[PDB]
Amino acid sequence: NLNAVRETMDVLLEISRILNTGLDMETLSICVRLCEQGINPEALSSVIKELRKATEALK
Amino acid sequence: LQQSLELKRKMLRDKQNKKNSGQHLPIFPAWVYERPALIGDFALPIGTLPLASQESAVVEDLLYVLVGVDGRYVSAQPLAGRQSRTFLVDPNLDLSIRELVHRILPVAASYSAVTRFIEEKSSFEYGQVNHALAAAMRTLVKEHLILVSQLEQLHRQGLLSLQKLWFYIQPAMRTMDILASLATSVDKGECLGGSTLSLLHDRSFSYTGDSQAQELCLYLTKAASAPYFEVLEKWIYRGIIHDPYSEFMVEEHELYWDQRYTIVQQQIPSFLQKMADKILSTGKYLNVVRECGHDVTCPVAKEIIYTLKERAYVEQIEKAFNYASKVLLDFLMEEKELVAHLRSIKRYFLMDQGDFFVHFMDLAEEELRKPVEDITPPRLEALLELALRMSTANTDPFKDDLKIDLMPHDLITQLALSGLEAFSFDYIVKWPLSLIINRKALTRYQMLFRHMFYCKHVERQLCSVWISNKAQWFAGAFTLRQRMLNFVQNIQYYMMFEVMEPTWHILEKNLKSASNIDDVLGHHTGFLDTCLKDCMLTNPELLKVFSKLMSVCVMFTNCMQKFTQSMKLLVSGFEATINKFDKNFSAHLLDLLARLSIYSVISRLDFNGFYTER
Amino acid sequence: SITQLFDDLCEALLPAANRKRAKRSLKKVAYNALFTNLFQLPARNKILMLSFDLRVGGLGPKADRLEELVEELEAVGSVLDLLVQLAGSGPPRDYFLNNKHVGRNVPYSGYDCDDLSVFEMDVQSLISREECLCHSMIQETLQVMEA
């Protein structure tokens, strides 16, 4: 079973790469595990876009 | 300048010496140490010119000489060791200018010393703490050059003032005076690694009031902390330290702990003395974790990182001690633990199996009699194997880890002739287990077992009186046996219920949470010593009388007491032996029971008035 | 798990080294955004919208890769909805590419010339990047001299 999940994370890497998202393999790995609980994806997008603004604002 | 060549050899030897962890230690190619340009140190009638020349003119060669380069009327007479770094100034120069020059020049002097620290101490010969620090102090030198260039553009415009220059250099003077103090201190003989890590705490306190040198010293320490903490990971979170040198924390040997791993006590910083045994014991424990296969990793593993006042980083070592010592213990409480192991040792050595040795004596009488040197250990191992099997002694799994061994000495270690003087057993060691249950310590344990076997063996001798008389009328032999058995059974109840089990439980209960292996070793020592002391004879008078008592009795109980020379199955030579044994015994009995009075069993040996006087 | 995923995602977003209570501040920013939003056209269609405006800009085979690299998930719709709604956000060679002199049965075509000014703009990019880089270096160390 399990290696199907790693290659799933290769699909869900490379497409996030060509969709030119800002993401990285840690955040991707957890965002799919949040989506598996039924959490709203547009709501996740709203926290992610504002947290990168604060991350810079700390300098 | 031979110092830069002698100290170099000492400090890399002090990194090659104790450890060869990491192969083929490098040294820098020689040409780096000998060009004058890889050191931060190296035409007019000036005196006839008006002051509109002079002030601007002298700041030219000064502004050169602020950097490690020569001047034009200011100069530098040559170095030869000479760590004050003197500077030469010309004649025909105005003395009011001169004093301000001498106010500035200590910059050039300390600078030459800083950069001479740079070229030399950055090399492989001086340790990772000096590497990261030499990076830190090669940082600020370019800012000094930036300042120099910022002054040079004013000088080029000719707008420049000596008083402005002097005003501007003040944070520089302060800043490299800070560095020169650390550098010159490390240059006092040595500061390898942790010996430096006096300074890197202590100099920040020494500057804590100044409030510019303070954060500077935080920076210098923030740089130097990282490599020492980066190897620290490998004994706090890992089974072997990857020290690429010998410069941090542990001496160690190839072969118990006092050999395996020992603290390098000044290669511990200003902070960590109270943590040094924590780290060393933790590293020792992680070595066992690795030794046993197990799992050599760590979930609290994160960077150890410096902070002066909010010094909470040292609790990482406590969190790691409460992980890594603890996970070793969690092994040692379901395998290589004290439990089923000590149940077997209690079963045989402390004779908790009282159904074992009835077989051994029902079998081994062919051994228990023969003259010297006829020792036959395969027969003894076969007697153990059979005396195991036929008994219930059969049933425990460590009986095969058990063995028969031999002892040379008949308790005369205090300060074949098979079995009686010479029995021993061994639950065999494993090197993973040898940190707790181990042969060198089990020697003391075998002495207790000799005593417990011997006293019940002379109880078998005394019990032979019962079977050898029960014509059938005489009782003087059996009341003599009564006078002896009233002692030897009631010492044995004490020696068996009191000497071991309270003391043993005193250790046993601790095993559920005992802090660490050295604590367990302390419990084991105290337990075995306290029992050792809870045994009858273990006194400087040695109660040597007991050997004589038991001797004259063994001549009675077995050697003469045989069906009254078969008379029942009368010349008074039978009774004369009872009389002579009584004459020895009653007096030796008196002295022993008196000693048992003056040194709790004696109170029950008197009880209702059982003689009281023999 | 549930609350712990928001915990360490905040740590992933927090930068590498005051590394103390900001970690709570950012969590409050996350919760604020999450719950001010929650109380107020499937994925395949969504990505085709992005497939297209890629395919018009140039870069057609990349656009082809996108759709073939995700027809494969028939055996994650909410997961894809992350990448599209975050698509703009990110941070701002081959020899077999467009080369008639190699390969086997190449068909007749006659001069492209746009596939040459393409190639000529790539080489203009690789000189212009390394001129703007030389401008961004020379200003840097000269500024701290002039300041």
UniProtKB/Swiss-Prot annotation, chain A:
One of its GO terms (biological process) is mitotic spindle assembly. Keywords: Acetylation, Cytoplasm, Cytoskeleton. The keyword 4Fe-4S does not apply. Its main location: cytoplasm. GO terms for cellular component: centrosome; cytosol; gamma-tubulin ring complex; interphase microtubule organizing center; spindle. Disulfide bonds: none annotated. It is found in: Cytoplasm, Cytoskeleton, Microtubule organizing center, Centrosome; Cytoplasm, Cytoskeleton, Spindle. Required for the recruitment and the assembly of the gamma-tubulin ring complex (gTuRC) at the centrosome. The gTuRC regulates the minus-end nucleation of alpha-beta tubulin heterodimers that grow into microtubule protafilaments, a critical step in centrosome duplication and spindle formation. Belongs to the MOZART1 family. Associates with the gamma-tubulin ring complex (gTuRC) consisting of TUBGCP2, TUBGCP3, TUBGCP4, TUBGCP5 and TUBGCP6 and gamma-tubulin TUBG1 or TUBG2; within the complex, interacts with TUBGCP3 and TUBGCP6 to form a luminal bridge with actin that stabilizes the initial structure during complex assembly. Interacts with TUBG1. This is Mitotic-spindle organizing protein 1. It comes from Homo sapiens. The gene is MZT1.
UniProtKB/Swiss-Prot annotation, chain B:
One of its GO terms (molecular function) is gamma-tubulin binding. Its main location: cytoplasm. The keyword Phosphoprotein applies. It is found in: Cytoplasm, Cytoskeleton, Microtubule organizing center, Centrosome. Ubiquitously expressed. One of its GO terms (biological process) is meiotic cell cycle. GO terms for cellular component: centrosome; ciliary basal body; cytoplasmic microtubule; cytosol; gamma-tubulin complex; membrane; microtubule organizing center; nucleoplasm. Transmembrane segments: none annotated. Keywords: Cytoplasm, Cytoskeleton, Disease variant, Epilepsy, Intellectual disability, Lissencephaly, Microtubule, Phosphoprotein. It is linked to Cortical dysplasia, complex, with other brain malformations 15: An autosomal recessive disorder characterized by global developmental delay, variably impaired intellectual development, speech delay, facial dysmorphism, microcephaly, and varying degrees of cortical malformations including pachygyria, thin corpus callosum and subcortical band heterotopia. Most patients have generalized seizures. Component of the gamma-tubulin ring complex (gTuRC) consisting of TUBGCP2, TUBGCP3, TUBGCP4, TUBGCP5 and TUBGCP6 and gamma-tubulin TUBG1 or TUBG2. TUBGCP2, TUBGCP3, TUBGCP4, TUBGCP5 and TUBGCP6 assemble in a 5:5:2:1:1 stoichiometry; each is associated with a gamma-tubulin, thereby arranging 14 gamma-tubulins in a helical manner. Gamma-tubulin at the first position is blocked by TUBGCP3 at the last position, allowing 13 protafilaments to grow into a microtubule. Component of the gamma-tubulin ring complex (gTuRC) which mediates microtubule nucleation. The gTuRC regulates the minus-end nucleation of alpha-beta tubulin heterodimers that grow into microtubule protafilaments, a critical step in centrosome duplication and spindle formation. Plays a role in neuronal migration. Belongs to the TUBGCP family. This is Gamma-tubulin complex component 2. The chain holds residues 150 to 868 of 902 of the full protein.
Curated annotation (Swiss-Prot), chain C:
The chain holds residues 3 to 184 of 1819 of the full protein. Component of the gamma-tubulin ring complex (gTuRC) which mediates microtubule nucleation. The gTuRC regulates the minus-end nucleation of alpha-beta tubulin heterodimers that grow into microtubule protafilaments, a critical step in centrosome duplication and spindle formation. Component of the gamma-tubulin ring complex (gTuRC) consisting of TUBGCP2, TUBGCP3, TUBGCP4, TUBGCP5 and TUBGCP6 and gamma-tubulin TUBG1 or TUBG2. TUBGCP2, TUBGCP3, TUBGCP4, TUBGCP5 and TUBGCP6 assemble in a 5:5:2:1:1 stoichiometry; each is associated with a gamma-tubulin, thereby arranging 14 gamma-tubulins in a helical manner. Gamma-tubulin at the first position is blocked by TUBGCP3 at the last position, allowing 13 protafilaments to grow into a microtubule. It is linked to Microcephaly and chorioretinopathy, autosomal recessive, 1: A syndrome characterized by microcephaly, cognitive impairment, underdeveloped retina and choroid, and epilepsy in some patients. The more anterior parts of the retina, near the periphery and pars plana, have a grayish hue and diminutive vasculature similar to retinopathy of prematurity. Visual impairment becomes evident during the first year of life. Transmembrane segments: none annotated. This is Gamma-tubulin complex component 6. Signal peptide: none annotated. Belongs to the TUBGCP family. It comes from Homo sapiens. It is found in: Cytoplasm, Cytoskeleton, Microtubule organizing center, Centrosome.
